[PDB]
Write a protein that binds this ligand. Structure first.
Ligand SMILES: CN[C@@H]1[C@@H](O)[C@@H](O[C@@H]2[C@@H](O)[C@H](O[C@H]3O[C@H]([C@@H](C)O)[C@@H](O)[C@H](O)[C@H]3N)[C@@H](N)C[C@H]2N)OC[C@]1(C)O
Ligand SMILES: CN[C@@H]1[C@@H](O)[C@@H](O[C@@H]2[C@@H](O)[C@H](O[C@H]3O[C@H]([C@@H](C)O)[C@@H](O)[C@H](O)[C@H]3N)[C@@H](N)C[C@H]2N)OC[C@]1(C)O
Ligand SMILES: CN[C@@H]1[C@@H](O)[C@@H](O[C@@H]2[C@@H](O)[C@H](O[C@H]3O[C@H]([C@@H](C)O)[C@@H](O)[C@H](O)[C@H]3N)[C@@H](N)C[C@H]2N)OC[C@]1(C)O
Ligand SMILES: CN[C@@H]1[C@@H](O)[C@@H](O[C@@H]2[C@@H](O)[C@H](O[C@H]3O[C@H]([C@@H](C)O)[C@@H](O)[C@H](O)[C@H]3N)[C@@H](N)C[C@H]2N)OC[C@]1(C)O
Ligand SMILES: CN[C@@H]1[C@@H](O)[C@@H](O[C@@H]2[C@@H](O)[C@H](O[C@H]3O[C@H]([C@@H](C)O)[C@@H](O)[C@H](O)[C@H]3N)[C@@H](N)C[C@H]2N)OC[C@]1(C)O
Ligand SMILES: CN[C@@H]1[C@@H](O)[C@@H](O[C@@H]2[C@@H](O)[C@H](O[C@H]3O[C@H]([C@@H](C)O)[C@@H](O)[C@H](O)[C@H]3N)[C@@H](N)C[C@H]2N)OC[C@]1(C)O
Ligand SMILES: [Zn+2]
Lengths: 60, 218, 159, 105
RNA sequence: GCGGGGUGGAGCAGCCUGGUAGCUCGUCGGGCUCAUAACCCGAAGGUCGUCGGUUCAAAUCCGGCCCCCGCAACCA
RNA sequence: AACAUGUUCUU
RNA sequence: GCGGGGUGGAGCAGCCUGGUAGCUCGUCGGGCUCAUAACCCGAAGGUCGUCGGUUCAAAUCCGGCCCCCGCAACCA
RNA sequence: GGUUGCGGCCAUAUCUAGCAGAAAGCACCGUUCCCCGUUCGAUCAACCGUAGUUAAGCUGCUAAGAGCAAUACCGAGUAGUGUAGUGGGAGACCAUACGCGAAACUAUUGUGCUGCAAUCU
RNA sequence: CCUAAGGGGGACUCAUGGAGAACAGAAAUCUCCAGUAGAACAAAAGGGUAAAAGUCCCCUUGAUUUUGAUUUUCAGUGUGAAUACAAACCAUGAAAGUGUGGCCUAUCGAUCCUUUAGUCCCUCGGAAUUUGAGGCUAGAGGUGCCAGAAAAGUUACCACAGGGAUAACUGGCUUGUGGCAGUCAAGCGUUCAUAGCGACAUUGCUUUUUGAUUCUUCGAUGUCGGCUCUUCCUAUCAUACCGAAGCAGAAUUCGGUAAGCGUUGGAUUGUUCACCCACUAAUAGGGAACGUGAGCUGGGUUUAGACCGUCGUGAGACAGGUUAGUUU
RNA sequence: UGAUGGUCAGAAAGUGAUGUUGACACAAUGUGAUUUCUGCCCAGUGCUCUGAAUGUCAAAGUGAAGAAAUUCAACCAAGCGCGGGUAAACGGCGGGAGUAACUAUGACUCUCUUAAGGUAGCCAAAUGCCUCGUCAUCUAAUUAGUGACGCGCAUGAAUGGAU
RNA sequence: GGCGAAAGACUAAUCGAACCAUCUAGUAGCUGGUUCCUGCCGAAGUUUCCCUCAGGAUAGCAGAAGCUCGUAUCAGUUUUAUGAGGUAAAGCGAAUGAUUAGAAGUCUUGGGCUUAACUUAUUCUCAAACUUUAAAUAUGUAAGAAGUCCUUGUUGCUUAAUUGAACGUGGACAAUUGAAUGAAGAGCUUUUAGUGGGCCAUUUUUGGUAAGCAGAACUGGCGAUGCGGGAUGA
RNA sequence: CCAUCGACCGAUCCUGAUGUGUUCGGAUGGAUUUGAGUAAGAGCAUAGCUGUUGGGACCCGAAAGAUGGUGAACUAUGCCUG
């Protein structure tokens, strides 16, 4: 009495290609969320020390 | 009763053999596949005549049984039982299914129609390709036309079209008649009941030499 | 009822190769992975830990993270009308280097060397690859090679 | 399920913060007070005319419950709760399985 | 359209799953009695209703010809 | 308290 | 489509909730009687419909198959 | 070149059946106070290198050897398959055009290669 | 389901077969040999595993604490489950290591409410103390219709909104089932497959059976049978002319052209159907919206009355029976 | 149901109907003239009776603890539970085997089992599926009618049976 | 509520609960309708959840407004390099399972020279839930400036370390900046409509005897579309 | 304006100085945690189209439910008088 279509993927790729299929944008620096916490922790200090050293040598 | 054979003629379904997944399957109507003088030696029956399918279809075990009986009975009547060896070359391994709708008035009250329609086992059929040999008979060269007529009668028991082909090869061996005579006279074949064994130039040389003592190494 | 569990459909994909069961050769554990390396993902059915989902079986991606026994790999997955960046943690048994990249780095070195050779010689060379071009003209001798005529053959049966 | 009566696990008490010996008992819910706000509200809503004012669950389907272990540290007397998987039979300090003996049917 | 069945004189096995048909009642003899009845001992008794096929081998499987007894056979 | 029965036909 | 039954020669338990097959009648041996019945003292007799499975262990628990008796099959 | 220790790839290295093996190495081999483990010094432990032996392990060689590996005017451009037509055919199916392309089969060849360290007639 | 069937370490090797040892045999335990897993690993199936992931021994609680990142299902929400790290605290081992439950893929649960554990910390608002109550963090009590209402029937007295998204006719596709016709020829037919028949098989046709389906119609296509009347089909019962025979004649049987012409009267039943009686040259089968209700009839079916049986506690039910019921 | 009552009415009342009444009456049901009869079952559902002895049982009251809110305990009405009655209350009213000197049949026996196992009657009946039951009669011919028969799907005794 | 010798009858043509006014424009996931022109863009019948299945929310598809820029690196495509896969086909004198026939042994193992079993070499035939092998089509990734090389800075991470890891200073390499073809340009944001019954064709494919039947896959269509042809016809 | 590593404020976990109504205080330093925050404000007000929710809610449409009234000139039944 209410039997109807159960499933089809007809027209689905056609809809997907109207505006897709778009690759995610790439960036020079990735987010370090999800990277090993011990690496990320020390990388913080390594960047901080590098700025301090460059700020020093530029004075002289 | 049995539905007419047109209801299960063509290979529409995947093969559905008897297995762990359909156990309640009846026996095929054909039980005997080797008739005539099945103990005869390879050199006794040099001529091979095939009945070849020209259809991609399903042959019920009932048709296989009827054709076997027809051919065997005719050839035995004309040339005697020991003058040939007939081999049915297809085995019905495909199970046929049936849904079994009621044929009384008011069946629609009782039954559910196309709901849950998966069928019960009904019969067995053999799946044959175009060019597949159905039956084979080896006899002597003087018995050509008797076996040809015997197979001619069996053809009418099958749906569709079949051809009767005279083979160039010696009996049921894969060798042409001249090739078989050359292998025989060179001591490279021995009898093994109804069949033979051929010489190997591989393996232990001592066993090869013992097994075919009359071998002419060349 | 339907069944859509985590490893459904993996009967053959996660089987070990014929006569390739048992212990993992140690070369698998001696490889070194770095962030930025490109790796092929192949599930080993004998290592149940750190396994890829069947989707990532046969996919190639970038390494983004390196831990004790595993690497983090970035995979792009088509979801609807766009790609989603996926991050999968895989033990090294399920990972292998990609060979095309080694080839490409070799070509980088060769291009640099050729350019330097031309610069020392005083000229310019072309570094772009080229597709296969149509062949040029040629002369064929018939010495001991007289053209031999062929014809179609008649039909024969061999049954 | 047989679970032993003592268990050496981590203690969160500010005295310990380490693995200590614990006493294992099974948790049992206490008596519902008549002065909990939910119950004072319910009684007020049920008074007067109107009949039953709230739903009453009927379609029970589970046959088991989750067992909660009560672990008390023998040093500082801090408790911890630890739930188990569903089981139909549970006992503490039952006799351990002996391996390789003839059954005396 | 079906569903069972046709094995001694009559009731039943043997069939399922080919090679090897038995008991029961009843008849033909002896045992016992004064003679019977009963009782006991023995003995004969069906190549399977019939015609076909498959089979090395058919009461046993697969068809046809009869007899026995029935179950099912618009409708709005 | 319990205790039913006795083939046919004679000489 | 369901539901119950299948256990000594007969009619029934035991299943459930695994470890032993219990009851009445019947059968057989001896006794009491002139004899028989009743009665008394003894003895045999069900591998649990069947093929599998699990379990250390199957009448029992878990499927297929076979036979027996039943319930449901409605709105036009 | 032999051998040992630690290996990489993980049968061209495996398996059966014979035979041979100098030097060193390895091995079997002797013993039970001590550390240690056993129903048993068999295995495990320890001690001697002293009494012996290449018999076995191990290494190599042999076999119209089994297995394995490799190749191919072997089968076969076959089976299968992408694209095409108002192609053929009642249909099952088949051919053609532009492409890809097996397996079995057959025949022939091979039977570990190698890294680090030490040592040797 | 499991305190091990979880974690670590160690030693060993499994099914099965062969050959041997008192009672001892097919099956007791002891020995050796072969043994790529043919075993085992809680439980379905698939995958995985041999100095192990199996068996046995030893020690254990990582089946723990804090809170983030990720994978599957996916809206890239929730739940379930899983993966790799960080920071603790532990187990085990000589050690490298390994361990955040069960070798992997299933084994489960919001808001409100209650209850417990933790900080014993916040609040009870005129100020305090002690009871009591209320909060914060983390679990448990459960929704299996499993993203999670608190829930029995009957209507043959019935209503409304709709539905041809959907049943009860015709029609359409199909043709299993029904009906009809071929091919082969084992046998029957005194001999003889085919005068006449014809098993086992096998190819079709038809839409006069019954199903299957749900395309049309639910702002309605009048829903049985008979009566009446016309016409069509041929798969021919009779009548015309013929061919065949196991055609002497008579009778009969098989077949061809043929639908020109006919194919009846009655008992019982609402019947189509069935079944007898009888006449006849013969008493063929079918179609036309299952022809034909502004042509009839209204016996049946199928509104409301009433009775019975079985069922139901009951209201009531019943392809069970019975009687009365407006045909524009 | 004997009036301080039964049955019924009303929002209430110093309120009503039966009632100008009193068991030969009023009220509530079932069956349905006469004749002849009206079997067995109180296990179930109801209805009803008994309460000195008695588990559970509300509010109030009682005792204890507490500073108090409160908590706990005992006691505790009817009701429930326990025990009896009642079918012209609702209703209900059995299986499997064997057995006689032809055969058949089974008066007879064994066994399981209920609250009781459908008695007297009656029947293919307006109640019987199978079924157009079988036999007889009626007709030329009868799915009709009538008389018989009865393991009766699913007849049956005031849910009244047979006349 | 009445009244009923009982039909759910009768109670002013109204009765399985009269008539009148009001609450009341009661609510409806349902049926019907919904009013001028031209221009530009232009769908969906699919995903997840729902007492959800004639309805919603959610994502998708569509429009509008733009904004930041101006050839940056993009593409329903090829080439080159490199992965993954277990379908088609094939195979069964290869494992598992199925399966016809002899033959030679074994009798130490059970019957009547056999009869079956067992062993060995053979023989006919098969598999959606078998497999050593194994395509075609389809599918992942790369082809540089965010690069390569040289020197040596940072750090609490890492190494026995002066070893590494990650991010850098300074130096060098220039239009062939490292395949093809194309590019009414690229990137970014907000907001909202309709839709959430589909259906057809080739090929693959499941149930069913089959169906203008029922259910999937990829692509193209019809729906939403006229036009020439197929007489006629989504 | 965008990607990324930090810093600041509140919540959470740890640390715990000089001191003390000795149980308070919380200097200082940490932490794969957390917020609809900071880091040289952007808002408020009026108006317009579109979109949303409550309203009769685009228009017309139930079967029902409730409150207060009016009928025994028909008809049902009793009674009284013909
Ligand atoms: C009454 N006791 C009898 C005893 O006498 C005997 O009976 C035989 C019976 O078996 C015989 O029966 C046999 O007879 C012959 C047999 C001898 O081969 C067979 O051919 C025949 O088929 C078979 N019925 C019958 N012919 C005579 C009885 N007395 O065996 C049977 C028995 C029941 O024990
Ligand atoms: C004595 N100094 C304490 C200092 O220790 C700290 O106290 C925290 C306290 O705030 C936390 O507690 C905090 O968080 C809990 C909850 C969310 O876990 C709340 O229940 C509580 O009210 C809240 N203050 C507590 N759990 C740990 C103490 N060290 O901060 C508060 C303080 C008073 O300064
Ligand atoms: C007028 N009386 C007639 C009476 O003659 C007789 O008629 C039959 C008729 O029923 C037969 O017909 C019957 O039987 C045939 C069958 C035999 O093929 C069926 O096909 C047909 O449907 C059926 N009506 C018909 N073949 C002969 C008439 N005399 O029976 C029916 C009847 C109505 O009683
Ligand atoms: C070799 N493989 C082929 C595969 O290529 C394909 O074949 C098609 C074939 O079916 C097409 O044919 C198809 O379509 C046409 C028409 C509508 O186009 C129909 O007429 C025809 O009946 C239909 N089979 C044919 N036109 C081209 C082949 N490549 O499909 C069939 C196949 C056997 O799988
Ligand atoms: C306490 N440890 C901190 C760690 O928590 C983190 O600091 C976060 C910081 O990242 C968050 O800040 C983050 O989120 C804010 C946002 C809320 O607006 C952004 O503005 C900011 O860019 C972003 N980094 C800040 N909101 C809280 C700190 N504790 O930074 C690293 C750390 C030092 O280890
Ligand atoms: C020039 N000084 C700037 C100062 O202006 C400010 O910059 C903020 C910048 O931090 C914010 O950006 C920040 O916050 C966003 C936010 C979405 O959470 C983060 O996504 C982002 O990572 C974070 N850097 C940016 N949205 C606005 C600037 N004015 O803070 C950073 C700074 C460097 O000090
Ligand atoms: Zn503690």
């Amino acid at each position: 009495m209410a039997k109807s279509k159960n499933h089809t993927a007809h027209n689905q790729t056609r809809k997907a290609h109207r505006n897709g299929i778009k690759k995610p944008k790439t960036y020079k620096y990735p987010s370090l969320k999800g990277v090993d916490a011990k690496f990320k922790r020390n990388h913080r200090y390594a960047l901080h020390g590098t700025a301090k050293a460059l700020a020093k040598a530029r004075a002289e | 009763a049995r539905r007419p054979a047109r209801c299960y003629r063509y290979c529409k379904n995947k093969p559905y053999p008897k297995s762990r997944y359909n156990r309640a399957v009846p026996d095929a109507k054909i039980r005997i596949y080797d008739l005539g003088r099945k103990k005869a030696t390879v050199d006794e029956f040099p001529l091979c005549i095939h009945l070849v399918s020209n259809e991609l279809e399903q042959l019920s075990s009932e048709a296989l049984e009827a054709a076997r009986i027809c051919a065997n009975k005719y050839i035995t009547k004309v040339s005697g039982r020991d003058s040939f060896h007939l081999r049915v070359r297809v085995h019905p391994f495909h199970v046929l299914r049936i849904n079994k709708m009621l044929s009384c008035a008011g069946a629609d009250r009782l039954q559910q129609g196309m709901r849950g329609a998966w069928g019960k086992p009904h019969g067995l059929a053999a799946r044959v390709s175009i060019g597949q040999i159905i039956m084979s008979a080896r006899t002597k060269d003087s018995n050509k036309d008797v076996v040809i007529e015997g197979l001619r009668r069996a053809r009418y028991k099958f749906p569709g079209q079949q051809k009767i082909i005279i083979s160039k090869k010696w009996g049921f061996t894969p060798l042409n008649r001249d090739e078989y005579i050359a292998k025989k006279t060179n001591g490279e074949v021995i009898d093994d009941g109804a069949y033979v064994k051929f010489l190997s130039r591989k393996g232990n040389l001592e066993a090869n030499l013992q097994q075919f003592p009359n071998y002419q190494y060349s | 009822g339907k069944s859509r569990g985590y490893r459904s459909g993996t009967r053959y994909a996660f089987q070990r190769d014929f006569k390739k069961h048992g212990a993992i050769p140690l070369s698998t554990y001696l490889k070194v992975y770095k962030v930025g390396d490109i790796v092929d993902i192949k599930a080993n059915g004998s290592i149940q830990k750190g396994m890829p989902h069947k989707y990532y079986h046969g996919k190639t991606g970038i390494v983004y993270n390196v831990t004790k026994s595993s690497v983090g790999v970035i995979i792009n997955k088509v979801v609807g009308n766009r790609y989603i960046e996926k991050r999968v943690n895989l033990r090294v048994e399920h990972v292998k280097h990609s060979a095309c990249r080694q080839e490409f780095l070799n070509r980088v070195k060769s291009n640099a060397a050729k350019k330097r050779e031309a610069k020392a010689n005083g000229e310019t060379v072309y570094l772009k690859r080229q597709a296969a071009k149509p062949r040029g003209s040629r002369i064929i001798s018939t010495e001991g090679n007289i053209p031999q005529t062929l014809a179609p053959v008649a039909y024969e049966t061999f049954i | 399920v047989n679970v032993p009566k003592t268990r050496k696990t981590y203690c969160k008490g500010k005295e310990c913060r380490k693995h200590t010996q614990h006493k294992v008992t099974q948790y049992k819910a206490g008596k519902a007070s008549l002065f909990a706000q939910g119950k004072r509200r319910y009684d007020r809503k049920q008074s007067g005319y109107g009949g039953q004012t709230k739903q009453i669950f009927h379609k029970k389907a589970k046959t088991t419950k989750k067992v909660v272990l009560r672990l008390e540290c023998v040093v500082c007397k801090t408790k911890a709760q630890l739930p188990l998987k569903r089981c139909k039979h549970f006992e503490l300090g039952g006799d351990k399985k002996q391996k390789g003996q003839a059954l005396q049917f």
